[PDB]
Amino acid sequence: GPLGSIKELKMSKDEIKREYKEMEGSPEIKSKRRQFHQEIQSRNMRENVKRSSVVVAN
Numbered sequence: 001g002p003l004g005s006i007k008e009l010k011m012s013k014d015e016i017k018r019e020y021k022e023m024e025g026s027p028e029i030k031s032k033r034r035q036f037h038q039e040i041q042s043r044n045m046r047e048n049v050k051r052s053s054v055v056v057a058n
Contacts, residue, residue: 049056
């Protein structure tokens with residue numbers, strides 16, 4: 001019963017270490033691309049057409 005708790009606890013430590021490793025991956029470059037991706041997201045087609053509207057465009 002309580003034994004499983006210890007095993008899970010150990011795994012938690014591994015997860016924390018991974019976070020630091022991710023930093024070494026130099027995600028700064030990828031982070032820059034994400035910023036631009038957000039801009040393109042606002043250009044969603046859904047936003048172009050409103051659900052409430054029906055006589056929009058042809």
